[PDB]
Design a protein around this ligand. Structure first.
Ligand SMILES: *[C@@H]1O[C@H](CO)[C@@H](O[C@@H]2O[C@H](CO)[C@@H](O)[C@H](O)[C@H]2NC(C)=O)[C@H](O)[C@H]1NC(C)=O
Ligand SMILES: [Ca+2]
Lengths: 139, 175
């Protein structure tokens, strides 16, 4: 319908995560779908990419730190999941009907990062910036 | 002596074949359950819009030979007073419906074919304070599905202007 839907394939083989400047401009009430890495069952666990997806503030986004300033949004620990890749869905709505949900405002920026499973000490985390566009730009 | 699920919204397969009417009503949005497991939830909050009549229909559910069928709902519901933008009058209930059917596919959705089981209320509505402090104000409501004289049935949820997150829907019988 009227809203737009964005699909992000969140894995280290996606060249959009390359420079660490992957961003998308969305409108209020738009959708974002994030897909976990998925592999044929013959691929062993240790050779598959797994992680936790966090929503963090700008500071956490910059330093790849989810601990002091982040919320867990999704877990990609099923690389062989039935029915295809696990899919995280977000709607950029003003008000959440979920007491642990997340709210969005026009004109503001939001940040996601992933932390690998199993955990290494890297600070080369995959990340995404989401800019929620002003109301005037979204009719 | 043991429960057998006919439908679980938290399993990958259980959340397939659901339909919203209309779109932009009930939405499929990632959330978390009471066991800190990220799951698909079903949410609606169109209180900044007029004349809402949002339906959510589950996949077809077999009744097997089971006599008594239960539906377990886990949800959060927002206090209307805690919502900065409300255009009409916000509700703090939603409706549960069912419809018996022999067919799991090719069934055009028709509201008038659905029988109301109950109006669902929240023992606890959450506010901005709950949002800010990250409190999970989870409600649990168990109902029974009416007489099913077909091979199975669809369940449906109706929203008429409430701010509701369906965290979990589980349909089951006991053995
Ligand atoms: C890692 O990400 C890439 C995209 O960067 C995935 O490849 C895409 O898969 C989707 C759905 O299968 C296709 O529609 C796209 O055309 C593919 N590539 C591109 C260029 O967009 C890839 O599947 C992901 N790998 C894993 C392990 O899941
Ligand atoms: Ca841009």
């Amino acid at each position: 319908a009227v809203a737009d839907r964005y699909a992000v394939y969140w894995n280290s083989s996606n060249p959009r995560f390359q420079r660490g400047d992957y961003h998308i401009d969305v409108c209020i009430n738009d959708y974002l779908d994030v897909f976990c890495p998925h592999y044929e069952d013959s691929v062993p666990e240790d050779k598959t990419e797994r992680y936790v997806l966090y929503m963090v503030n700008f500071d956490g986004y910059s330093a790849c730190d989810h601990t002091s300033k982040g919320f867990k949004r999704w877990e990609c620990n099923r690389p062989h999941s039935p029915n295809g890749p696990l899919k995280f869905s977000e709607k950029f709505q003003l008000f959440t009907p979920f007491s642990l949900g997340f709210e969005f405002r026009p004109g503001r920026e939001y940040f996601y990062i992933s932390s690998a499973i199993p955990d290494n000490g890297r600070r080369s985390c995959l990340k995404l910036k989401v800019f929620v566009r002003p109301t005037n730009s979204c009719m | 002596s043991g429960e057998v699920n006919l439908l679980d919204s938290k399993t990958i397969q259980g959340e397939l074949g659901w339909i919203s009417y209309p779109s932009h009503g009930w939405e499929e949005i990632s959330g978390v359950d009471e066991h800190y497991t990220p799951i698909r939830t079903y949410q609606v909050c169109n209180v900044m819009d007029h004349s809402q009549n949002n339906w959510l229909r589950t996949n077809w559910v077999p009744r097997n030979s089971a006599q008594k069928i239960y539906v377990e709902l886990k949800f959060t519901l927002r206090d209307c007073n805690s919502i900065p933008l409300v255009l009409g009058t916000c509700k703090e209930t939603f409706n549960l419906y069912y419809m018996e059917s022999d067919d799991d596919h090719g069934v055009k959705f028709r509201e008038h074919q659905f029988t109301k089981i109950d109006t669902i209320a929240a023992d606890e509505s959450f506010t901005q304070m709950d949002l800010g402090d990250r409190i999970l104000k989870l409600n649990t409501e168990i109902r029974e599905v009416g007489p099913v004289n077909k091979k199975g049935f669809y369940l449906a949820f109706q929203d008429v202007g409430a701010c509701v997150a369906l965290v979990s829907v589980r349909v089951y019988f006991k053995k």
